[model samples]
Target: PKTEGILHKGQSLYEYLDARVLTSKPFGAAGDATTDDTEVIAASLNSQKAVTISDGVFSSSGINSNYCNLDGRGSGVLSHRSSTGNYLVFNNPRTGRLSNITVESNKATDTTQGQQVSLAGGSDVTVSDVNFSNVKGTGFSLIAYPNDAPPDGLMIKGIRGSYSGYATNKAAGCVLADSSVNSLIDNVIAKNYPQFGAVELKGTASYNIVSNVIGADCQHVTYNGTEGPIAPSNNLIKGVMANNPKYAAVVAGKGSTNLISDVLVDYSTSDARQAHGVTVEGSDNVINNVLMSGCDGTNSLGQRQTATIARFIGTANNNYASVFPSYSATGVITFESGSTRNFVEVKHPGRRNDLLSSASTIDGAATIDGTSNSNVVHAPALGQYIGSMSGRFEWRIKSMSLPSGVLTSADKYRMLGDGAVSLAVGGGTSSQVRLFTSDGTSRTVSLTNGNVRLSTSSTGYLQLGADAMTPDSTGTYALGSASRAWSGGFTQAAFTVT
Candidate 1:
């Protein structure tokens, strides 16, 4: 007779009152059960774990089809224990009248595995402060696969955690619309227990943000499907320790548009050969502000058979290198014939070796010099003299290749932008001549059998061209202008400003 049942009843009533009993609203209909109006689902401990929200007119447009409010004082975990395969399904088929809806995962362990927290046919779905883990297939996969509607106006923010699968390798944390467009992913962090990578954005994943992503042993940060285009911008990839051999820090496909900036890639081991900082085989993409250090191989410089950065059949701009181990004289930068009409700026602040080899067939004009540091041929000073006026220019020279010893390797031809061009004529097949033009274009035309032609216009513009050929053992060359507009013979040339 201690009145235990009475005490329990009083305590339960006090708990309900303390949780704002009178103000709390449960899931119910408005006006009539069939009427189309904004329905309010309030916070409650005993509410349905999974809610199939339909037949209700949304308060706003383009965010989510339903509003999920959880009791902060209750267990703080939204468990979808039912076998329905979807936690919350929002099926809205209208446009521009249902948006600004927020899905706040304020629970301790909010799960969406058997079925994902799906936004099938809506716009501007904002997900924040949510930890989606242990999903059966995907932790938080957008249901735009097969023929589902594109999550066009989608926005994902502050999503953190993992997606694991024990039996299969198709476990994914987040899968965007297979061919979705205009999606945004920002401030997301995913980690461990992965059969697949953290996120896969398929089908024109354009105008999206994957910023500040941190993962471990992740196969990939973001993978573009074979047909979908992947565009990653303002993303940070850190500590991507992948165990898979084909894992890459970022793998962009043929038609993908990736705007990779401020990304730092750290490979787990040094001997791992499959970790690339950024690999792009696509066209019309940009990789800038990338500081990929401590990778398994070199720093995008293809060192010791490991390429840190590779852009095959594409264009690039504003890329830098910090720690390239196997950097060689021939490893400064490599370009192929398909890389025509591309501009690459290397900000190494060190000595850049040569422009092109003597065996190279450079179609356009190139310049090299030694102004950044103190080195020999093809240095940085060559770039400072020629500041963007390229096309055809003129040069006047003197035949001082023999007596002055100005053509030897020890005393090579030095041409500055002082209205003077220098020539070096060897006694063999061909000699070397360095031309400095006002248009920042330098060309080393072949000297025919050790012969060069230095032409000067009557208007005081000098042009130096070369023609070379080899006979039995010796070769003959020539160097001078066709128009005799200079005042010096085999020693000096002074042009008149006519």
Candidate 2:
């Protein structure tokens, strides 16, 4: 017979299990028994009995040396403890669904330690909205031994763990699916344990996703250690911290590839230590948008130590900096070696070629509107400056008049010597100039006009005017040289022409 609802509401199974399950021999009260009384009644129930009794709130209770299994029930404010080894173990094959439950410890004087809840060999187990406190050992353990494959589809959510005693073998977190795949740990918080306090993922659990999670002030948040290389790719860690001395925020062992972005770190103290913002020891990875600062010396901000906007060492095509520091004290733009390329076109009159010892060749056009001829003359000793005496004129006539049948375009006037001048005239084509020397000599020079022309004025003045002044040794003048008279009207008549 399948025992249907062994103990329901408005019913009692106290005397059916043990007649002395409740004390006060005349009254019917549930808590009138000692620790020995409750153990005797719970032990009498079969390991396969499915008990369902409500409105029987058990508080500060004890069940010692009991091999009982509970399934398909809801427990409230139930405190159970065993001082000896392996106090509470679940080996039943039934799918026990314990929901909306709270398990606490009783402050008793027992040298034998207390243990926490353990689960083994069950599939589709959902432990949600459960809270635990004052647990001596691990909060939850999923143990699978020597089996080829274990149960699957286990969901643990909104679970919290905390402790208040000195126990070495405590775990506020879990160890699940060793050398297995497709496991998850999401939305959990653990605090205050001796060893392995926070969340941990171990042993060949590949293709897992841990997103939108947070862990604070624990020994370690996430740790991975496998014999072969372990790569947790396509995993995101946004706004997480492990702000304790004994723990790192995240550790990826020998050959692991993680995609960590938008992270921030602060080394809490000034001691010279190695707390990497994100460390990649192996090869072939990508890290982007990383902003780090406030480390001692071993750690740096970005990819390199001395990387400012002015000293970037990467591809900068059409990149610009608005506020770069000046490179030199004078603040001049200088090109580096092997950094020049031609990008402009130069023309004839647009270029400037300075001549040192002689006059530059005028090979371009010149616009003249008067009676003048244009020519080029190479004066022997009077290179460019052709006058020497004071109050004497040095003239270069372009031409006396326009040619009879040629309309003059321009002229060229070149000084041969003091009072020695030459001029050339231009019509639509070939023209001529009347030349004069300092010792009363005169001639005519021809002009060939094309795209370029040079001209000068005929009767225009070029006088070396004299003043009552002479220059000193330093090329500055005093006002008294003309007062010391000479016979030639305050100037020597070396050359004269009119």
Candidate 3:
């Protein structure tokens, strides 16, 4: 019997603890690394019970969990001794929970198709505070059954893992949520996977959130849907800190309406293959607040390399990006062929501060391909401007060539750099300037026969207050009265009266 007021009033300590916890020690299982605990762990899951593992390495060929919680209290390790199959798997429609454990592989290098922990056909499951090391396959995977129902409402957080030593492209990343919807993955630190590093959300996965990650490896933290039925759409990936990315920091795949924001990546002195900051490949997506600094580094072959802050390619259209102010890259932002209708806003994206650079083929801050159309790029206004007297005109400092036949179909009023001012006329070259009278009457001043003729084409005559200055019907205008004569004379070489 337990002491009163200590635990559950008067019940014994074992009775109070046994009601909710079913430990695997008494189920004919040893905690030694050599002894196989597969049967004991299987018994616990079959009983639909919550399990508590003791502090030691438990060998498992493959085990399945369902409708239960398994806790190791941060001291137990589940070792995969086989070359195939995952260490632990949670099947579909089962709300299982796992916490505070470490999963690893005994082999130095694993080429088989095995992962540390797999949530196969899982829904509403939770796995937290799990660490993985030296596993060739994915450390943790949340996937659905083949050709069956998709996984939804899953949460995996506080995960730390890495896969090194063996270089096989079989499995990559610490987490791969394939075809998962409405899931949440947070607080993950991953390093050194051969393929897409850190976290991956593939297939028709939508409405998922991945946040607060520190990742570094050969490839990017990818969101892919090309291998699935439809693209992964409407997902949100934010709050990422990436380092030494060989490919790109983040790659938004061929999915529409997804968002990748609040990301910072750096590759200073690290060997990068092609260190791109954010590669957006979908339509109507948003990439915002990304800082791609310290990308000037060396490549894998020990050659000089540079990075690109943003790259939009492959049918990427109608997307938008608001990048951070300061960045060092060969191309701050680039729009490849097939990218259209995209908009970007940055501070001082171009290298040149003068307007004359637009005339020639100087590499501007951004490289917009000719194949891309209708992109709105807003960097700092680059030009040495001179204001007009009324502050309406702006003049550049140097000679700049305009593209031939440009602005042909635009609005008619134009002031060119070569001292040419064009104004639109309704027609009739004789009367070029039209005006409206006080009584809403239309009037024109004709420049016919190379003379300034006022109101020559209009029925109403032009007058300045009681005929002090008036125009007659014979294309002649008389200025100044006898009492108020003209004071300023024309300074010309000679004047003749004919």
> Best-fitting candidate, measured by lDDT?
3
Off by over 4 Å in 3: 1-26, 107-110, 137-147, 166-171, 325-327, 348-372, 381-409, 412-498
Query: Tens digit of lDDT per residue, candidate 2, span 200-239?
Result: 4444444444433334434444444344465334233334
Q: What is the lDDT of residue 92 in candidate 2?
A: 30
User: Which 10 consecutive positions of candidate 1 have the poorest summed lDDT?
Assistant: 368-377
Q: Model 2 compared with the native: what TM-score?
A: 0.39
Quote the positional error of residue 68 for candidate 2 in Å: 13
lDDT of 1: 0.41
Alpha-carbon RMSD to native, per candidate: 14.6, 27.4, 12.5
Q: How do all models score by TM-score?
A: 0.48, 0.39, 0.70
**How far off is residue 346 in model 2, in Å?**
48
Candidate 3 at 461: error in angstroms? 32
TM-score quality measure for candidate 1: 0.48
- The lDDT per prediction is 0.41, 0.34, 0.67
- Candidate 1, residue 456: lDDT: 28
- Order of candidates by lDDT, top first? 3, 1, 2
Indicate which candidate wins on TM-score. 3
